[PDB]
């Protein structure tokens, strides 16, 4: 293992990730960026980070009865907020940034003429 | 689908930008109407 | 596949909000001329 115990389990039906601290001990202690952000009791071994849809980043580690384990930086770019900037969206942006402005201006012209 | 996922958010932001102009025009007309009361 | 449906629902909701924010502005501007 070489003092590398933290692993990530994936490839399941749902979109979730689980940190697996592969170290024999009791009352394992989870960290994040060196701080005390989480804790765990028995009857559960895989810490939950949430869904892969919310891009769980960070720098996670665990600690058993022996010395503290070694970290494992997790990066997840499951963006799902990405917009395709091809030659159709930018054209759609311009055609929606001109007609609306023109209608607003042709309304303001009449408003000012009334005033 | 990776095409519909992008298509939906390429129109969600477009309609989120045509809603911040209707509010501006509503503010303009409200300011122009409150001067007559 | 459980978030594309929510995105489509939100887009429909924004379309429905826009179709009323246009009507409000049009009605007020018509009032401005009568």
């Amino acid at each position: 293992k070489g003092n590398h115990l933290v692993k990530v389990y994936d490839y399941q039906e749902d979109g979730s990730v689980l940190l697996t601290c592969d170290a024999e001990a009791k009352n394992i202690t989870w960290f994040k960026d060196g701080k005390m952000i989480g804790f765990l009791t028995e009857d559960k071994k895989k810490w939950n980070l949430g869904s892969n849809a919310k891009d769980p980043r960070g720098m996670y580690q665990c600690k058993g009865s022996q010395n503290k384990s070694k970290p494992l930086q997790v990066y997840y770019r499951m963006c799902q907020n990405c917009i395709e900037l091809n030659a159709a969206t930018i054209s759609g942006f311009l055609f929606a940034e001109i007609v609306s402005i023109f209608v607003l201006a042709v309304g303001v012209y009449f408003i000012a003429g009334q005033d | 689908t990776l095409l519909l996922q992008l298509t939906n958010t390429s129109a969600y932001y477009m309609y989120l930008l045509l809603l911040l102009k209707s509010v501006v025009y509503f503010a303009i007309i409200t300011c122009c109407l409150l001067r007559r009361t | 596949t459980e978030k594309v449906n929510m995105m489509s629902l939100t887009v429909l909701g924004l379309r429905m909000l826009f179709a009323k924010t246009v009507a409000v502005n049009f009605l007020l501007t018509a009032k401005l001329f009568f």
């Binding site: 159709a88 929606a96 007609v99 209608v103 | 095409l3 519909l4 298509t7 129109a11 | 379309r15 179709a19 246009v22 049009f26 018509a30």
Partner: peptide
């Protein structure tokens, strides 16, 4: 193609509705 048709049909319908509202209200 099919999903993109709705987001451009709504615009033309909206413009037609606004134009026909404005031209109908002209008769007063």
């Amino acid at each position: 193609l099919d999903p993109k048709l709705c987001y451009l049909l709504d615009g033309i319908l909206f413009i037609y509705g606004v134009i026909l509202t404005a031209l109908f209200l002209r008769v007063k």
